[PDB]
Amino acid sequence: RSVKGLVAVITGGASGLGLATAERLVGQGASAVLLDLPNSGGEAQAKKLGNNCVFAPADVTSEKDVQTALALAKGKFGRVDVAVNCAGIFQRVLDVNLMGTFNVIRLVAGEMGQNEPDQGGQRGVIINTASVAAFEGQVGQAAYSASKGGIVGMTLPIARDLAPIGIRVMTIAPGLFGTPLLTDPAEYAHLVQAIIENPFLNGEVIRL
Amino acid sequence: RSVKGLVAVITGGASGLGLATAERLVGQGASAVLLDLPNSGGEAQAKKLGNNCVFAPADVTSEKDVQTALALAKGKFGRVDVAVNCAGIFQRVLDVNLMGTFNVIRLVAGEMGQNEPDQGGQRGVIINTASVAAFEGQVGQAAYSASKGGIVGMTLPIARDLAPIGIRVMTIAPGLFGTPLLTDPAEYAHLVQAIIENPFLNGEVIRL
Amino acid sequence: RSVKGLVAVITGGASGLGLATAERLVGQGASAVLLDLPNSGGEAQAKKLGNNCVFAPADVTSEKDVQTALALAKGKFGRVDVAVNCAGIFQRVLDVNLMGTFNVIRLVAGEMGQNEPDQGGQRGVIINTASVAAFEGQVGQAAYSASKGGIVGMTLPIARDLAPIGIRVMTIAPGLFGTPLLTDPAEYAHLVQAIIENPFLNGEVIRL
Amino acid sequence: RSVKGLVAVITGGASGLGLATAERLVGQGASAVLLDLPNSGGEAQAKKLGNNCVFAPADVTSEKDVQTALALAKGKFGRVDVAVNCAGIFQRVLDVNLMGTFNVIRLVAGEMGQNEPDQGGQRGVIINTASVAAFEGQVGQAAYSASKGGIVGMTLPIARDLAPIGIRVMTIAPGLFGTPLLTDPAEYAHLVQAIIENPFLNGEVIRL
Ligand SMILES: [Cl-]
Ligand SMILES: [Cl-]
Ligand SMILES: [Cl-]
Ligand SMILES: [Cl-]
Ligand code: NA
Ligand code: NA
Ligand code: NA
Ligand code: NA
Ligand code: NA
Ligand code: NA
Ligand code: NA
Ligand code: NA
Numbered sequence: 001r002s003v004k005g006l007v008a009v010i011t012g013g014a015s016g017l018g019l020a021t022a023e024r025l026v027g028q029g030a031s032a033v034l035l036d037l038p039n040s041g042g043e044a045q046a047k048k049l050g051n052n053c054v055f056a057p058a059d060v061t062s063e064k065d066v067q068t069a070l071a072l073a074k075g076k077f078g079r080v081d082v083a084v085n086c087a088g089i090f091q092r093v094l095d096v097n098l099m100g101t102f103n104v105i106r107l108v109a110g111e112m113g114q115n116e117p118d119q120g121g122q123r124g125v126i127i128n129t130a131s132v133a134a135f136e137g138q139v140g141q142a143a144y145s146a147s148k149g150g151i152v153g154m155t156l157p158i159a160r161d162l163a164p165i166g167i168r169v170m171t172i173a174p175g176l177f178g179t180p181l182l183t184d185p186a187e188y189a190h191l192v193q194a195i196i197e198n199p200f201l202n203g204e205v206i207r208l
Numbered sequence: 209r210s211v212k213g214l215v216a217v218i219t220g221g222a223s224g225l226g227l228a229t230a231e232r233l234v235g236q237g238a239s240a241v242l243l244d245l246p247n248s249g250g251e252a253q254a255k256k257l258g259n260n261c262v263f264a265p266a267d268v269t270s271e272k273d274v275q276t277a278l279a280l281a282k283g284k285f286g287r288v289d290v291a292v293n294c295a296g297i298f299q300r301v302l303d304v305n306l307m308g309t310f311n312v313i314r315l316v317a318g319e320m321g322q323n324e325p326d327q328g329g330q331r332g333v334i335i336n337t338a339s340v341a342a343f344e345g346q347v348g349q350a351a352y353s354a355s356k357g358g359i360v361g362m363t364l365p366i367a368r369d370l371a372p373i374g375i376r377v378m379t380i381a382p383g384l385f386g387t388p389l390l391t392d393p394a395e396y397a398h399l400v401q402a403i404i405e406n407p408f409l410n411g412e413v414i415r416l
Numbered sequence: 417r418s419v420k421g422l423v424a425v426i427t428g429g430a431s432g433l434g435l436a437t438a439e440r441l442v443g444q445g446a447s448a449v450l451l452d453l454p455n456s457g458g459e460a461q462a463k464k465l466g467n468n469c470v471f472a473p474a475d476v477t478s479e480k481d482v483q484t485a486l487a488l489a490k491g492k493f494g495r496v497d498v499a500v501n502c503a504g505i506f507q508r509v510l511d512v513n514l515m516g517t518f519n520v521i522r523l524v525a526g527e528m529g530q531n532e533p534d535q536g537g538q539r540g541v542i543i544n545t546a547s548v549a550a551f552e553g554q555v556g557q558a559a560y561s562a563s564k565g566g567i568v569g570m571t572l573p574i575a576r577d578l579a580p581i582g583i584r585v586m587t588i589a590p591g592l593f594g595t596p597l598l599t600d601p602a603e604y605a606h607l608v609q610a611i612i613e614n615p616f617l618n619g620e621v622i623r624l
Numbered sequence: 625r626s627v628k629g630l631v632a633v634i635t636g637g638a639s640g641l642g643l644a645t646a647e648r649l650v651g652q653g654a655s656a657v658l659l660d661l662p663n664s665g666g667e668a669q670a671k672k673l674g675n676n677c678v679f680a681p682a683d684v685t686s687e688k689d690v691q692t693a694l695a696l697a698k699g700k701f702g703r704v705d706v707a708v709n710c711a712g713i714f715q716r717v718l719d720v721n722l723m724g725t726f727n728v729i730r731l732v733a734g735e736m737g738q739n740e741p742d743q744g745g746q747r748g749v750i751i752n753t754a755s756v757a758a759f760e761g762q763v764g765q766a767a768y769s770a771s772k773g774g775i776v777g778m779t780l781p782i783a784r785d786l787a788p789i790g791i792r793v794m795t796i797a798p799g800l801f802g803t804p805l806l807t808d809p810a811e812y813a814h815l816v817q818a819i820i821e822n823p824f825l826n827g828e829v830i831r832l
Contacts, residue, residue, distance in 0.1 A: 343576050343577065345573065345577060346573065347569060347570060347573045348569070351572050351573045351576060352572070384572070384575075384576055384579075384619065385575070385576065385579040385618065385619070386579050386580055387579075388579065388580050389533055389536070389537025389538070389580075389582045390533065390537065390580070390582065391580045391581070
């Protein structure tokens, strides 16, 4: 129930929610691999975060690039315990977020499978970020959700699919109110840590 | 979490729930603008409520009249913090209540937008009153609601639409039993104040 | 919140749940009018229950007979405060229970209307008994209910219809398990009293 | 039971007990109208007391002047809740104090009548000041009073006369010892406030 010692791969880690999650986790004793595009500024950020953080240049929509990134993570920290998908947050449906997430989940599951189970039998934790569907003034049922639905709808199924390997799968979705109060990373990061530390949360979607 | 110092525009403020809401708010330290038709008796009521209350002669279904009323409110109290729609409570569907409410919401949002956010980031609060659909002896699902549905169904959508400006939108609906016990304004007024003082209530419909 | 002093008309009062309800209410200080068919044994039972109980010979499916019964109740105890429908508990749909209940409700509402409201504004209380639909081995949704549905489905609508007169309408339905444990009136009677003493219960169906 | 929000008309408000009462009431959250002769210095005092105080130039013995003063009070603060007679404190019997008081009471009663009753049903409060009859060395019964008697003797009768309108009438009289201790406004002002805040005091004379 502690992130200390865990190795986390964070897509879109050079900035935004990804960077905020990395800073939080590293500050809590974990190791982080910032997986992001070359020239994204991930190299500088990984450097600033200390020797418990490395930069893995890669495009999340590329299976081969993600394999190289996971190999780097294993080469530098020994293994992969957690994957946090924060990248990208054709065009609207199969966007970078959905494609990168599915690509990461399919590849990291095999890696996490090699890990030895813990007390509760968990080998890994995967945390996804739902894609936001901008409010367009719709009325009725559609108004009750702020996410596209692709990643959210796949959460329970994927959690059930990886249960035998002891891999928990959770998704963080947006709330209905932008909470912009004008025109929060910390909150998102704290939720990531909380999900990682509670072995009882699995196959669920939590709105921030 | 206090209505003291707030400026509230109340449609249908010359009598009924509107007047009761004005008396309550003014008695609690807020300023009120009674927006009602000329010769509605709003001038006399505004006078009796004290120098923290003014009368804005206007027809809520008229955009130009409401603009004049909001300008008067800004000219007399400096700004508009709250809007309470109590007016009217073609014919049945697009009634005075629904049309006046939509007209007020569309216009006051821009005004409230100019306000500086508060601690929680709120710039304004809009409270609506659902139209009552008189019980006709229907059985089945229709028997479970006492409101027409137009304003009620638009509550969450409008709350989501104005979230970026920090404007909360809430609606007060009738209960299933007339609570007439024969053939309450105070209760309604107290609920208005409670909604204004609780920054956590947004996009919801509360039955009285 | 006390049945003491109240006058209750109980259909099917010569035996079964009706008699059990009468004994309980009279034992608690209320007055009861046993409304049942001539030669039902209601005359003897009314006699045995004491001077706070009278027998009103009548067929509940007959409007004229029920009018005579209510007139007797007013002539003997002054008024009608409560009506409990326990009679009959063409053929299957429009059975004695449903027809007697609707006939009693339509007639007693006018009588209860003449009563002066109480603290909470109530003039009367009407309690119905759902008709039992014998279990036939059905699977699926139909297995989740033990009542025919006619009286049960009319409960909320009738409660809303009589709200202005201050008359509460409640219905007692059977549970899914006969609770026969072999091949309870007291429980039913205690529930009747509890419904009468709680002014907050209205338009609801309670399974025994 | 609070003077906050109340509008008080105070005769002889430019100085003495009148001014002291105004300062006290305004300091406590009420609004005050200083009713006094032109060039009495009431204009300057009203100015210094803030925007919750105005000066109504008028001679209390003139009905028309008092009407103009009450109209000003309604025009500036919306209504008249309290009247405090402190003016003048032919010649000895029908002095300015007695004549001004009767004139004010007769006129303000009608104004206070238009107010909506409060919890206890009060629409207004009128407080009078007895005229002092200077001690002349008399012995016997006459030595037991320090007031002329006109206003004091009319207190209960006037209180009974205005009871139906919900207007309380009280009078403050001098004590037998000048309490001069040499050759108190604050005390008098505090008593005025206390009378206004206690709805149980009516038709009585209280010696200071
Ligand atoms: Cl999604
Ligand atoms: Cl509505
Ligand atoms: Cl039924
Ligand atoms: Cl006197
Ligand atoms: Na990022
Ligand atoms: Na590839
Ligand atoms: Na109104
Ligand atoms: Na217009
Ligand atoms: Na029976
Ligand atoms: Na008949
Ligand atoms: Na004076
Ligand atoms: Na005159």
